[PDB]
Every structure is written in structure tokens, then in C-alpha cells.
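Ticket 4471: requesting a sanity check on a complex prediction with potassium ion. Repro inputs:
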Amino acid sequence: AAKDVKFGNDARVKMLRGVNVLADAVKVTLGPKGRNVVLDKSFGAPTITKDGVSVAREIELEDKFENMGAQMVKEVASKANDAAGDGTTTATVLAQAIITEGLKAVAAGMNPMDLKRGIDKAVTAAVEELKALSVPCSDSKAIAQVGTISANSDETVGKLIAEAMDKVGKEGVITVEDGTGLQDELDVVEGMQFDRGYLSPYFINKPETGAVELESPFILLADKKISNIREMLPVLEAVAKAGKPLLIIAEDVEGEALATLVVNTMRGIVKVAAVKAPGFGDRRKAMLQDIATLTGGTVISEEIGMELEKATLEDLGQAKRVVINKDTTTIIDGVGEEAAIQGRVAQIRQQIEEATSDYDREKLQERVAKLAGGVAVIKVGAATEVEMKEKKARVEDALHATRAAVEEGVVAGGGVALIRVASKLADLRGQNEDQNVGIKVALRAMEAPLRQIVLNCGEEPSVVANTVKGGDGNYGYNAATEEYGNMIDMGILDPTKVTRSALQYAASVAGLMITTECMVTDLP
Amino acid sequence: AAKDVKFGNDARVKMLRGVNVLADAVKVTLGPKGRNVVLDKSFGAPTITKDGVSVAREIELEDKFENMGAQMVKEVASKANDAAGDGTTTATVLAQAIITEGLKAVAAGMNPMDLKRGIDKAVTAAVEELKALSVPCSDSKAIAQVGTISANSDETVGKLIAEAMDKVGKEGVITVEDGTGLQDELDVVEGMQFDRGYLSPYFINKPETGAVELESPFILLADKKISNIREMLPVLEAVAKAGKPLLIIAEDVEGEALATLVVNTMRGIVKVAAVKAPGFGDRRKAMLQDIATLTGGTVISEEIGMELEKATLEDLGQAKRVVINKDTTTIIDGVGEEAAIQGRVAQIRQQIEEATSDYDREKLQERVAKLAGGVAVIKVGAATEVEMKEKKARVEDALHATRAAVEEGVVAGGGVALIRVASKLADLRGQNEDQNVGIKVALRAMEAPLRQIVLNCGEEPSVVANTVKGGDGNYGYNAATEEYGNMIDMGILDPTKVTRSALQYAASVAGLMITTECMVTDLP
Amino acid sequence: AAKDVKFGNDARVKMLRGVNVLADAVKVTLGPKGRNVVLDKSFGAPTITKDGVSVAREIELEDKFENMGAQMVKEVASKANDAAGDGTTTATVLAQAIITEGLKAVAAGMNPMDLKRGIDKAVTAAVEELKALSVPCSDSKAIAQVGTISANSDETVGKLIAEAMDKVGKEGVITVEDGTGLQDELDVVEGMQFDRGYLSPYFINKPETGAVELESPFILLADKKISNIREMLPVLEAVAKAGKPLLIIAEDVEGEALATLVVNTMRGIVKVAAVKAPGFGDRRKAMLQDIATLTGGTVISEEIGMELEKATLEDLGQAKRVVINKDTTTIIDGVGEEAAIQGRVAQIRQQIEEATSDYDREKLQERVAKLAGGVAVIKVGAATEVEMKEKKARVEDALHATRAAVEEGVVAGGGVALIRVASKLADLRGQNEDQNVGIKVALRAMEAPLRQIVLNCGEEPSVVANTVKGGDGNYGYNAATEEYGNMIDMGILDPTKVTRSALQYAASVAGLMITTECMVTDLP
Ligand SMILES: Nc1ncnc2c1ncn2[C@@H]1O[C@H](COP(=O)(O)OP(=O)(O)O)[C@@H](O)[C@H]1O
Ligand SMILES: Nc1ncnc2c1ncn2[C@@H]1O[C@H](COP(=O)(O)OP(=O)(O)O)[C@@H](O)[C@H]1O
Ligand SMILES: Nc1ncnc2c1ncn2[C@@H]1O[C@H](COP(=O)(O)OP(=O)(O)O)[C@@H](O)[C@H]1O
Ligand code: BEF
Ligand code: BEF
Ligand code: BEF
Ligand SMILES: [K+]
Ligand SMILES: [K+]
Ligand SMILES: [K+]
Ligand SMILES: [Mg+2]
Ligand SMILES: [Mg+2]
Ligand SMILES: [Mg+2]
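Returned C-alpha cells:
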């Protein structure tokens, strides 16, 4: 593959022109008065989005060098979304700022490797100062606040997350799905519930709605699919002699085994229900042990020294009540030690830290929430499918933000935190004169986010930056109300993590990026 | 791959140009004096249609940006059809008006997101105002009127649909099909009728055309296929001893059981006929118990404590008569008390509301109707294929509209409803001056539909709009007579559902669309 | 993909230019002095044809808009052929005349949708005037005349068709095949005849050419091949005492069974012949019960309760005489008389009508004719193959025409019919002025066909039209002799069906076509 090489200011400029494109395209979505971008998709109708990394991911340039530039800054936006879920635009805006003033500094002839050392040092300091400005976010008031801001001033969304986090606890999981009507809807499930139906419609008890109810039943668990015919008599015969109902959770139940269970329950011999296991293998098998230890039963596996025909009443689990409908199965207050239950959650703590990243965290906490806490699901409503993609995207941002705000705390929004930490670091110096510039470049660049928000309002950024920098603490500019005031009192909150993350990531890549003396790529 | 990005008014102009194409092609079909669009098809001859959403779907533009714009408003036309089934054109016109006046406001430098907030609130208000103006549609005259209007002034369509709804009621199902002769025809099937043929042609009785008539028959139902063993004998011997012709409803009957069945009917000991069960596997089993309880029979299931070999003369139901032909099977009378049937009809009511939308509702309402009410079918009498395609489309259009008008009520036609609610919302204000403009852009755009129906007459739209705004109530312009009057007395009717829908949908995408500061797409 | 849209007079013209091409290529074949069009075929040599729809189907234009136009009018020509089989050209000229004057009326700004209503009212009115002017076609003189006219003044074709219709009855089928000798040949078969040969040639009786004559034979029907078990013979032992000649029609006859049949016939105990059944199962089996009841025999089926060895002498049918050859087998008179036969004829009546249309009715009427009436075949002949294809098309045209002329009656040819009803509709008016013009446009267009015929003679159409419009009754212009006179007495007759159809179909597409305000297609 024949390559093409460029040097010096020639190459830097080509790179910069590319970066500016990715950045200038992301910038328009910043802040409450920030605007929307349309991304063309071959697949279906276009996508309208205010989410920065969403726009960033789609940017690709024809000039190989400009492309390289943009493709490099596209990473700072992406790394933010995989970490925080908010601040992608903020992080991207910071990244651009560092590089512009940075590359300008190289044109001054200053040594770049020294410039990076200065920046990284200034950045390290700024993070510490942020750890200082960080105040804990606890009350559902603050939760609604960080949520409302990250949602672009949707108070319903903010209020919705605070309720969800409040009802199911901090361990409760929350998911975002497409809506039916035009209204947002909050669903809450307490206790253990998974999605599967009764295998035969004939299992319905007295209650209508297709509800099957079992009071103080026996639960049975199989690692394998049942099928055959009758199978398992000793366990069923023991439950019949016992005087209680049985619940069966297996890989599946084939028609022969189902029929014989149906005939016995129809005639009235023994009250019985049988339901399919939660998921495909290892999803299912893992969630039996979650389910097994909750109800104090023992999982019967073909992979160990036990089998279905040999079973004891002790292998069975017990619960107060169980409810099964066409799509759902529920276990009301099953009986297992709090010791054993907390044992399974503690084992998932080791499961919390993984290499799987996203979707690993969604399905892992899902098991945990079901075992201890409860689940919350938010249904986003819309008139049309394109508004749905916008509403749900604003909801996902707000969800990650509130979660992040909860754990790592909050600082004043409006990017005023960065502009404040920059004011605190003013007396900072480096090893050499060149390193000093790298430090100063960073502080000037921490102004960028605030100065960008104002510009999106079409107002003089120069004036607002001045009038905010003249003051101290949480005094800041409200872009929505277009008036100054206390950021914290006005409910404008940045999860500290998203602000910290945006700053760190942009500096890392931009620091490396201004060190470029050459660029190699494939020929057109 | 490599993309192309444009910003601001540069991009908006490109977007609008596209929108206008999609719209301008659709606009021409609006109103009674509106005209037809031709859509070329590679397979066969081209199609001539006045139906708006049909035209919108076919629009695709060469300029990548212009295309993106059009593809977005193409959605408002499509969502309209998916909701109401009428008002695709009107909704398209509204969007353009919103986008046109909307983008104009952004060019002024007003904040788009405030424009959107200003619009949706005005829209929300209009929805309430329309929902208030909606009046019940009951009398068959009114039904005939809205049907005729959606049919573009075809009285036969109005009078024909009104009769069908009048004969089988609100709940009767109506379907629309292609036809042989030139006159519209309405066929109605009473009692229980499902579509399947006799497996053996020798079952034919006196009546030609393959007619098989059976007096006081028996109904038998198999969850399973009855091909191989043909062991029902003991049940048959009981019925042969009774000397009655029965009806056999199974998954299917193979020639082995049939051949001996043929010979049995040939010899004369007992006349017997057998036809296939109505539906697909899970679907049919739901419709099997429905047929059994109608005739008072009991369903034979392999999933229950019964079996194919075990049945009694008592498990079969009785009917007055049954008629089986090449295509359809019929039971003219079943034997049962009104308590159990109306209960099962009441029980199917809960199955009626589901997620399954289309194809679910047709046969379900079909089943409910077959069990209690009746089914109605309308055959469209167009002469040729190019004339048939437009004719049938107007008939389906009118059907959804009558359906829509009945359930949610009707409002004054001629698009006069929107202009009327616009006058009622006149004092509506927003949070700031920009939001105020958003509201006015909405109200200003609500005149669009009427002035467009006028403009298609080649008459001054401004004058008619003014003189209509001069009046109140149902006062409006009649485009067919080209003179004014009362819209309701003149039988010009807008289903409240479609007008409300058309408004909401246009508002959704148009509101979102004017928020565009950038557009990203592929390179030519 | 990317589309292209044009509006208004811009698009209409493109549509028009297209229509004009399709028409102008068809026009030249109109009338006795009409000329021929050559259609190129890639595979073989070109085809020369006077058949109108033949030329129309081949037309495809490069400009997508013009193409759309022609492809739409290509349909009026196609529907004429699909209905009558004649009148295809006449219909096309009608369509062109209507469309041209219509667009002229639209360019005046008159409402198109009102124009369509005007025309159709005019068209519907004209049909009744035709139905009044329709006089019955009965005598073989008149039938020969309309056949001759549709044949382009070929008297042989008319008299030959007239001979066919008189001899074999109304139920007879008529076919057109390629010729051996330069001469046209009419072959007629009375009674029951099907095509299959004797499997063994040794069966020949007195008459040579392998002709077998069997007196009072016996009919047998088999769903099975007589291969495996040929020991079915005992029925023959009953036949050996009774008579020589029995005929067996089965799925097939194997060599071992044939061999034993040959030798037994060789000695002289009983002279016997055996032949295979004529057709495919579904069709042959349908024609099997036909032969059994014709001769008063009973069908033996393996799919029913009968067998190979089990037969009764009553199960066989009898005939006056039977003759069998290498190709065909024949039954002269049957013994089931009219009682069994017409019962089968009346039950097959419902099968005569269907949705299968062509291909099904071809051979179904074949079956019906064989049972009561007889089948007729016309051998069309020519010197060369290209002259044969034009010849066969005119024979098919004349064939379709006589069939159509018989059922719906005839009116004066030369298009004098249309121009005569046009004089009658002069006082017809619509609801508004635009509708009036549409009515006049139709009447103006009904003159087109006649003036076009004259134009093909290279004479002034205006002169003949006027001097023709001056007279009454059947007075018209004779294009062959170039002199005036009585159309019916001069033997120039139009089947009422073809003239009725041409107008209706031409009006259907032309009416819809002048409503076009827009056209969408793919980019070049
Ligand atoms: N009403 C407001 N007034 C002032 N600043 C705001 C307001 N709402 C949000 N902001 C600021 O704008 C930023 C919003 O970021 P956003 O564009 O939603 O995503 P990202 O954090 O990825 O840029 C936050 O840093 C916040 O401080
Ligand atoms: N004769 C008329 N005069 C004035 N307005 C009419 C008339 N007929 C219908 N309308 C209005 O216009 C609408 C019909 O639009 P139409 O042109 O049929 O588009 P579509 O076929 O997509 O519904 C109706 O909903 C009604 O409100
Ligand atoms: N000698 C004639 N004089 C006047 N009209 C004739 C004569 N021969 C045929 N015609 C007319 O020509 C028409 C048949 O023309 P042709 O092109 O063969 O069929 P079509 O136009 O229906 O495809 C008939 O309508 C008939 O009235
Ligand atoms: F651009 Be974001 F809401 F991180
Ligand atoms: F917008 Be419409 F009259 F279906
Ligand atoms: F179309 Be024809 F040969 F009358
Ligand atoms: K954003
Ligand atoms: K329309
Ligand atoms: K012709
Ligand atoms: Mg955000
Ligand atoms: Mg309509
Ligand atoms: Mg002809």
C-alpha cells in the first residue's frame, strides 16, 4: 500500500482543519440553547440528535490527513460516552481548544514535548481542585436537578429519575424503552420478577386475567429441559403427599410432561405450575442459582452427581406466594437466609468489575436488583419515531448523569466549574518556559465550554467570561434564563464525574496530538 | 465513508428545498378540485393515484441534502396513514407551512428550541380545542357523509359504507376487494362462516357448484392432525347409530380416513362430511374452542385428559344445518344457551386490546363478529387496473375515515376546524418572545389546509380565508360548489381523529426539523 | 432510487408525446386500406402484423415521462384484446382523441376532475344508445359477414368460420393452427373424441391404417397403472361369454399385460383393444366420470372403495361404435342418453364460469363440447411463416369477433355506429359547464375512428365525416369500394361488444389520464 508523507506546519494545518470539522459539527449541540444535528442514514429516515458522540461517530473526511485529524479527536468524544454518558460535547469542545492554542504555540517554535508535560501537569492539578469543589449529591432534589439539566431542561425526566432512584434504591436498575402514547411512563416492580409465561394456558387458577396463583408452593429447578413423560415422580409424589403446590422452573417442558401435569391438575390431584427458564444458556443457568439461593432450594443439574429422578424435598425451594401470567412469572417473598442471599450479591461484586463494559453492567445489576432491590423502567413517549430517538437519547444522557452525579458528586454547571478551577491554578508554573505555556493553554481552554454555551445563545462570549471570572465560587451564567445567578440555587448541576472525565480525556489526546511532526497515510 | 457536512442557513436552504419537493408533489391532490399524481412502476403499467401518503413514499432526491429533508417529512405523511388512514395530504401541507414559517424565524436569529416549545404548546392547545369540538357520529346519514367526503365526493361509497356499518353495526368487520363488473357491490355473510374447502369432492349433495348440505350435524375438534389411524370409530359408531350427518373439524384429513369416509357416504349407512380447521396452529387452537362452544361441542385435545380414540356421542355439538363448498364452510345455526356464548364473546373482549396492531385485529374482530355479529365485504367495481387501483384506494380511505369518525367523532370539514381553533387560541402566549413566535407560526400554519383547497380551485386563497375568519362556527367554503355556507349542513365532514392526528404529527417533525444547525451525509 | 418530478402543462405534454407515439404506430393498421407495421424480434426473423394490440405491447420509449404516458394507454389496447380480441385498434384511436381534446381543455384551465365526470356520463349514455341500435346476429350469412370484416375483407375466413359455427354447435371450440397446404382447411369432429393411441399396434381390425372397429364396446376407468397386477382378468371372463370388443382406458398398460392381451386377441376367442387415457390426472379424472356416465358405466377408483379384480359388467359403459388409432380414439353414441349426460352438463355449468379465465375454459369447454356437441378445428395456412403469423392473427381476430358478434349483436360498421350515437347525445348536459365540455369532447372523439379509416385511404376525413353525418340509419362510407351505401346491407358489421368495449376501455384510461398534474420517475 503506497503511502504519502507530510511534514511540519504543512501537516499540522491539514490535521487541524480536520479536527475543526469534527469539533465545529459537535459544538452546535452544546448547552440548553444548543441546536440539533441531522445524521443521514442509508438504512431509513435520517436521525436528529443533540448527543455529541452520536454526531462525532458519524464524521469522516475525504482528505486523508484531515480525516486522520478528525478521527483522532473523534476518540475523546467516544471515550467520554463509554465512561460518563454525558459531557461528550463538553469534552470535544475542550479538546479542540487545547489543540488550536497548542498548535499555534508550536508555530511559535516552542518545544511540543514540553507543552504536553505542562498541560498534563496543569490538568492533574485541575482534577484535584475539582475534587475540592465537588459537593455530595444526595437528596432527590439534587437528583432531579442533574437529571433535568442533562435532559436539556426536561423537568419531567429529571423528576422521573429521582423517583425511580428513590423507589428501587440506589441498587435498583433503570432501563429506557420506546413508548406507546405521547406520555412518559414509570413502571416499578418490587421483589423477584422475570419475563416468561406459563407453558400451558390451562394452569390458570380462580383469578381471571389469566393469573395463576400459588400460596406457599414448592419451587423446582432444572439445568436441563424436562420432556420425556412424567419424569420426576418422587418429587411430585412427595409434594402431593405433602399437601402443597409445586412450581417448576426448567430449561423447558415438552408436551408429554406438560400434558401429564395438565391432566393431574385438571382432575384436581395436585395444584401445579411449570414455567420456562429465564434465558439462553449461562443467562438461564446463572439466574437459577440467583433464584435457587433466594428460595433456599437446590438447583438440580445433569452436570453434577445428581439427577431428576433422585431428588429430595430439601432440593426444593419454598416461597410465600407465586404469580404467573401469560408473559410473566413472579415470586412474592421467597424464603432463603439473608446470609446466603447477601453471599450471592457479594460474589457479583467481583462480577461488577469486568472487561465486558457496557451491557455487562446492564444485565449484571439486573440479576442483583431482582434479588435484593427492585427494578424501574422508563417508557419514553413520542408522536413519531424520529422524536422517539430524540426523547430516549435525552433520557439516556440524564440517566447516566444522575447515576454519575450520585456516586462522584456534583459541581456548578455552565462549565463554571472548569472556569473556576482555572482561576485557582493561576499561580502554577512548570520546569521550563515552554512548559509554562502548556499550563496556560489549558486554563484558557477551560474557559471554552462556558464561552461556547453563550455563543450558542448568540451573545458576546467575551463579556460573559469576564463578568463571571470577575466573581468567585458558584456565581455563573444561566443560558436558558439569560441572566446571572447562583448555579447551585438555580438547579444547574454538572455531575463532577462527567466534567472531570471530559477534561481528562481531551487533554490526553490533545496533548499527544500537538506533538505531531509527521503524518503517514495511504494514497488516494 | 467520507461525509459532507454543511452548517446553518446553508444547510437549512438545502433541507427546505427537499421538503418543498416532497410537499409540492403531494399538495396537488388536496381537496375535491385537487388533481392526480402518476407514479411510475418498472414491473407493470404506472399507477394513477390521488392518495397523498402514496406519493410521499415515492419521493427521493438526487441532491444528498435535499433528499434528507424530504425523507424526514416523508415520515409525517406515513405516520398519518398508520394512525387515521386519512389526512395524509393535509398533514403534509401543515408540516411544510410550519417548516417554511419556522425556518424563516431561525433566519431572523430566533432560538429554534424555543420555537419548538412554542409550537408544541400551541399544538397541545389545539388538540384540546379539537377534542372539545368533536361531536358524536351516529346516524347513517352522517356516516354516509364522511365516507363520501373521504371518497372525494363519491356518494355510492358513502351510501355503501354507511349501509355496511348499518347492517353489521359498529363491530362488524368490513373488507375491500377488487371486483369484476362496473358497479359497487356489498356482500354480507350471516352466522358462523370460515374459509376452508371439503377435502373430498364426493361429499356433494343435490346442489351443484359443489354444495354439501347437512341437517342437524355434529362438531368435532382435534388439536391434532387426524390423517393416519382414523380410530374415531367408536365415536362414529355412536353417531352412525344415531343416523345423523356430522361435521369434522381437524388440522387436516388425509385420503385414508377420507377414502373409507367416501365409501361410507357412498354406501349410505350415514352421510358424513369433513372440512379443515380454520387457522394457523396457535391461531386456530384459539378459534377451535370458539367453534365448539358455539355448537355446544367439546374440543378434543392431546394436551388434555382426552384423546383421539376416546370420545362420546355427547362430546359433539349440534347445528341446524351446515353448508360446505369449494371455498368456504358454514354453520347457519348452533345449539347453545345465550349465557355461555355471550360470556365467551365477553371473554374475547380482553384479548381485543393488544400490542399486535394490524392483522391481529382483523381476524379477532372477525371471530368476535362471526360468533355474535356478522361480516361485511365490499367489492369495488372499477373497469381497468389503472382505474381499479385509484378506486380501491378511495374506498379504503373512506372506510378508515368512517371508522375514525365514528369512534372519535367528527368536526367541520374544509380544514375549517384548524382555522377555527386557531382563532380560539389567539391569546395564547409562551415564556419568551421567541416562544411567542413559535405559537404564531403554528396558528399561521393552520390556515394552510383551507387556503390550499382554495388554491387548487385556482381561486384567491387569501380572500376565502379572510371571509371565513370573518365568521364563526361551522361557516366555511365549499370547494365543489365554489360558494360559501355551513359545512355541517352541507355534509362536509372531518373525522376529529384524522385532523387531530394530522396536526400533531406535522408539528412533531416540523418542530424538530427547524432545530437543524448542521447536516451530515455521504459524498456523491 | 433518486426520482424526478415534473408538474402541470410541462409534464402533461411529455405524457402526451408518449401517447401519440403508441397511438400513431397503431393507427396505420386501422381499416381495409390500413397498412402494416413491422416488429423486430431479437431471436428470429421480424414479424409483420396488422393486429393493433400486437403493435401496442411492443412500444417502450426512452424518455421516462413519455414512456409512462404510452405505458398507460398501452393498457386500453390491451384491455380491448383481453375482452374482445378485436377492436384493439379502434379503442386506441378513441383513447387518443379523448386525451388530446381533454388536455386542450385543461390548458384552458377547466377543472379536469369535472371533465372526467362529464365524459363518463357521456360514455355511459352512449352505451345504451348502442344497446338500442344493437340488432341480433343470427343467419349464417351475417355471421360470415362480421367474420369477414374482422378478417380484413377475407371472404374465405368468414365463410369458413360461419361453416364451423353452424356445424358443430355453440358449444364447439374453435382453434387456429399453422397450415400445411397453401389452403385454409376446416375439420369437424362429432361426438366424443380424445387424443391417445393404442400401446400395442397389433390391435388393428378390418379397416386399414391401423383402424380398429369394435361393435358395442365396454368402458373402464383406472386411477392406476395395470402394470403390477394384470390378473384383474376375471371381469373379462364374464366378457368372454358375452362379446368380443371391450375397451380399457387406464393410467397405462404394461408390456406383460399388453402381451397377454395381444395373444388372446390373436386366437379369436375375443377381439380386444386397450388404450391409454388422454390427459393429466386432474383434467383426465374429471373427463373420466364424463365418459363413464356418457356410456352409462361406473368409474373405478383406487382412491375409493373399489379394486382391480372387483368389477361388475354393469360398471362398463356401452357405445354405438368405437374406433381407435395411433393418435385418437372415438366414441360415436353412448347409452347413458340425455339423463346422465345433461346432469353432468348442468353440474359442469358452474365450472364453465370461474376466475381461471383463459387456459382453464380452453379445455373445460373442450370437455363440455365433447359430451353433447362436437369440437371444430380450423387449419390456418400460408406460403411462408411470416405470412402465417399475420394470417393466424386475423383468423383469431375474426374468430373472437364472430363469437362476440353473436352474443351481444351487431351495429353498422365503419365506426358509423359511434358517430351515430354521438348525434343522439347532442342534447346531453352535465352539472356544470366544465362537465359539458367533457361530454362534447367525448362526442367529438367518437368521430375519430371513422375519419381515421378514411385518412388511411389518403382521403379528406372531413368530407366523408360530414356527408356521413348528414344521413340516417346505417348510412356510411365504404372504404374498400370507396363509395357510400348501407353498412348492414353491404355486409360490413361490427360486433356490438367490440365497439362497446373499445369506447369504455378507452374512456377509462383516457378519463383518468387527463387528470394528471404531476409525474414521478427514476433519473436517467
Ligand atoms: N439552563 C442552563 N444554563 C446554563 N448552562 C447550562 C444550562 N443547561 C445546561 N447547561 C450547561 O451546558 C452543558 C450541557 O451539556 P450537553 O450539551 O447537554 O451535553 P455535554 O455535557 O456532552 O456537552 C453542561 O455543562 C451545563 O453546565
Ligand atoms: N367539497 C369540499 N369542499 C371543501 N372542503 C372539502 C370538500 N371535500 C373535502 N374537503 C376537506 O378536504 C379534506 C379532503 O382531502 P382530500 O383532497 O380528499 O385528501 P385525501 O384524499 O388525502 O384525504 C377533507 O378532510 C375535508 O375536510
Ligand atoms: N370496407 C370497409 N368500409 C368501411 N369500414 C370498414 C371496412 N372494412 C373494415 N372497416 C372498419 O374497420 C374496423 C376494423 O379495423 P381493424 O383495424 O381490422 O380492427 P380494429 O381497428 O378493431 O383493431 C371496423 O370498425 C370496421 O367498421
Ligand atoms: F453531548 Be452530551 F449530552 F455528553
Ligand atoms: F390529508 Be388527506 F385529505 F388524506
Ligand atoms: F384489432 Be383488429 F384486427 F379488429
Ligand atoms: K449535547
Ligand atoms: K389526497
Ligand atoms: K387492427
Ligand atoms: Mg449533556
Ligand atoms: Mg380523504
Ligand atoms: Mg378487425
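Notes from triage: Chain C touches chain B through 42 residues (CB under 8 Å). Leaving this open until the requester confirms.
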